């Protein structure tokens, strides 16, 4: 058809995206998730050590 | 949750808004002229 | 300034220091530079090659052992060399050939030494070329 | 032609979107930034 | 009579591209001359003569095609 | 409500859902979508600092941000098989470019006045070459007035047209042919490739638009 | 040649380039100075608190 | 008559394409000039006359192309 | 008259190609400008005006080509 | 009249050839900018603005070509 | 509807000729990017963005050529 | 309709030129990668995907030109 | 159908210009290969396969035009 | 077969242009060969077969273009 | 065969565009020769025969173009 | 006899493109020559005859194009 083959290829494009770009973005986001949590806890630890 | 904070929308962004108004006015004027229909 | 001054120094005995000199060949990694006089300041790594020094007397060949061909806007050619080739009394075929062929077997001994043996044989072949 | 349906409407759209963005969403990022700065300092 | 003159004009127009290479070459010779002078201030007295010679040589090379176009036009 | 109206209202709904509905209760954790929005904000703010910074970057950051998000949401809905390129006229991008150029010129004539004409003579170019320089720079600015629209709009329309023509010309992919092996599946591979190309091109050209409007704003505010 | 990656550094390259001529020298040029240059008696003896002082290997 | 004028215009068009070489050449001349003057600042005074002369000659070639196109047209 | 205007359009289309080399020329001058400036920051003040003049009139050559195309049209 | 529109389309097609020069020009501009940032990373802040200026000039040449084609069409 | 369509296709070809410059342009941009990250590994995070910028700009020029072709196709 | 198909063939044949740019581009990318990896071997792991992407985009432009030729032929 | 076959042959003749890119492509690929192996012989074992692959891709791009021209020949 | 043979001749003439790219390939391959062998004489023995293979592969494209032109003539 | 002879002439004229490649290519070979001798003087004798052979191989493309042009003419 | 004479004129005009490559090759040969002379002032004796030979071989193509244009015209 004039447009259905695009629908067929959309599934493959989504599959390749989830295979390649999705894990990379997941790791990139989770790395700064852990970084922010750890730096926030470290700042709080420094503050409570100062008050102690 | 959601609150309104009054950032400057006209004190600093006036030239873009006035340019948009001028473009809209020119489009309205040329709709009956620059259409050839 | 008039002409060019060359500062040629060697660890055993320094050769030249602020002496008037014309075009001097300075074989670098790419090629030799025949600096006539003045010249833009440069910094080039010298490669084992013929350094031919013209003065008003004659054209004496000085096979250099390395150094830097560095120049200054005041036209100071300070060539910090190590060993020179006084006239042709340093020429000797047999010792150079035997040293080259004897360092060929140890050209693949141990990493750094293996790599440097090839360069030693290369400069020995340059000596062969300068032998005439 | 069929121009008085998307151009002026589009201008109203990006005006209201700019207003909503600048007055709502950027302040949340600014607030989280300043809160992290304050409880980090 | 009209077609032959028309094709003469077309041939002159397509020949005019001959000077493109001549100009680029004259200018690249001048560029290398400038680079050589900058990297060696004392070599100007040597580089200038053959630089001008190469300029004139490329100019004559371009003028060959220019004269061909001229004789296509007026001959 | 025409096709453009429904497309724009859907775009507004989804874009506002991406922020106000992502926050379940607006915690300080800054979840993965929240951290993605934070990264985008930081990136646009450092476009602003790097390219228009020095006295008044912060004032002009918000339009950069809003244009970036609008172009981002426009380019995101470009590859869906049904996705129509905002009524497929693309004159909207031209209008945006024209209005932004007009606003920049108004800002230059307001903050500099007649000094804006001195921008045509940056450092040298004395009187014999002054008219040539001013003509050249005026024509360059006139080209800039159309650069932004005939850019994102052109690429979006070209991608959509490539999409349509590719889909049309492979209609016999396994309809009646006997040679529909992987050699006949190669067209599917090129369609997949142009999917990836259109996505990457849309994102990188949104970045292009942001950096270009930042540079134009810097040229307007700062004379060099 | 490859006196940086395969080799070590410029110092050893230049030293061996000079030593090639020094060893391949005529008897008339062979004097006390070149003999002293040819002789090498420096032993690499690294520090204890700095590099554990393993052994006095040749330089 | 009209065909002669038609080929005249097409010849002028294919003669205007001669200026590409002049542009690229003056580009390379000023490029080498900039590189050289950036290398040593003391050489600019000496290298400016030769660079501008070579530029003027390249522009003269471009003007020859433009003059051929014009004498075609007019 | 049909052929005259037709070949006028053809010659105008062929003539505007002059901007190819104008862009290439401004780009080459600018490329050497960047190379020299990054290799020598102190030469900025004395290289900038010359480079500006250079690429400005290099684009003016393309402007001359555009004017030729315009006169072919009008 | 049909030949006139045919030559309009032909000239519009020929008008787009000059745009490849604009593309390669902006590209070599950014290439030299990459090389300059490689040599002098600290000069990036000073060097990027007139890099954008050079891109603007070359894209302007391409846009003169594009506008010539557009007016040849409509 | 015969000569006009014929010259329409011809002009579409003469406009698609221009993607060569865009291809060589994205090429030289990526090439200088490779050379820059080669000379200094540490400048990658700085030279990547303007390099993909130049790639996008050259690809947009190629798509300008493609658009000029496409209006001569649909 | 003979002229229409004739010009379709001509347009496709001249539109195939874009593979010139495609090949020149992929090979420029390959040449730069070769120079970079030879200058420093360690950077290969970080510069290989860069050249792969550049080659992919250049051959994508070439495929765009080829597809233009194909649609001029069969459409 | 005489003009159809005539312009088919013309298109096949012009379709071979794509081989120009393959030619200059193998040119630059092998030039950089020789320069790189001149830098250091060690990198040969890792740089030769990619040079071969690049030549293969360039010749494939040329073979695309060759196959299209063959379609415009048979 | 007037128009058909005429277009065959024109197509062969247009196909003859692949030899320019073939010559540039052979030429820059030999130029890099000369630069490499001058830079280090030892690397010459290894590079020479590489240059032989490179110019043979480059001339293969010119031979393909020559065959395409030949089949258009006989 | 009058139009056939005219097409023979125009095809020979088109095919004469192959000598650009041979000329600039052998010139690039000679330029690399000059660079090599300027760098390494001892390699001049060794680069003599290889560079002459490369010159002959590059000019083989021009010879093929001449043969094609003669076949088109005679 | 008129149309074949017209084709003779057109083919002779096209055959003069060879001056492009001839001049660019002569000039780049002289550019390498002058660069080697400036960088290596002690290379003139061994570079001058070979520069002359390279110039003559590059001009071989240009004089061949001139001769074929002359014989096509006469």
PDB file of C-alpha atoms in Angstrom, chain K residues 1 5 11 14-17 20 23 25 27 29 32 35 37 45-46 49-50 52-53 55 64-66 71 73:
ATOM      1  CA  UNK K   1       1.677  18.669 -20.818  1.00  0.00           C
ATOM      2  CA  UNK K   5       6.747  17.675 -17.550  1.00  0.00           C
ATOM      3  CA  UNK K  11      15.254  20.352 -13.593  1.00  0.00           C
ATOM      4  CA  UNK K  14      19.731  19.368 -12.160  1.00  0.00           C
ATOM      5  CA  UNK K  15      18.632  20.205  -8.609  1.00  0.00           C
ATOM      6  CA  UNK K  16      19.428  16.781  -7.124  1.00  0.00           C
ATOM      7  CA  UNK K  17      22.945  17.190  -8.552  1.00  0.00           C
ATOM      8  CA  UNK K  20      27.195  15.886  -3.734  1.00  0.00           C
ATOM      9  CA  UNK K  23      27.696  14.632   1.240  1.00  0.00           C
ATOM     10  CA  UNK K  25      30.485  18.441   3.485  1.00  0.00           C
ATOM     11  CA  UNK K  27      32.200  14.014   5.307  1.00  0.00           C
ATOM     12  CA  UNK K  29      33.077  17.839   9.034  1.00  0.00           C
ATOM     13  CA  UNK K  32      38.080  17.097  10.936  1.00  0.00           C
ATOM     14  CA  UNK K  35      41.384  14.381  13.374  1.00  0.00           C
ATOM     15  CA  UNK K  37      39.698  13.898  18.691  1.00  0.00           C
ATOM     16  CA  UNK K  45      32.910  16.343  24.425  1.00  0.00           C
ATOM     17  CA  UNK K  46      33.575  19.840  23.038  1.00  0.00           C
ATOM     18  CA  UNK K  49      28.358  19.122  19.179  1.00  0.00           C
ATOM     19  CA  UNK K  50      29.436  21.692  16.601  1.00  0.00           C
ATOM     20  CA  UNK K  52      27.035  17.264  14.391  1.00  0.00           C
ATOM     21  CA  UNK K  53      25.827  20.858  13.940  1.00  0.00           C
ATOM     22  CA  UNK K  55      26.557  17.728   9.610  1.00  0.00           C
ATOM     23  CA  UNK K  64      17.118  22.134   0.127  1.00  0.00           C
ATOM     24  CA  UNK K  65      18.331  20.608  -3.135  1.00  0.00           C
ATOM     25  CA  UNK K  66      15.923  17.708  -2.594  1.00  0.00           C
ATOM     26  CA  UNK K  71       8.451  20.651  -6.237  1.00  0.00           C
ATOM     27  CA  UNK K  73       8.090  16.112  -8.991  1.00  0.00           C
TER      28      UNK K  73
END
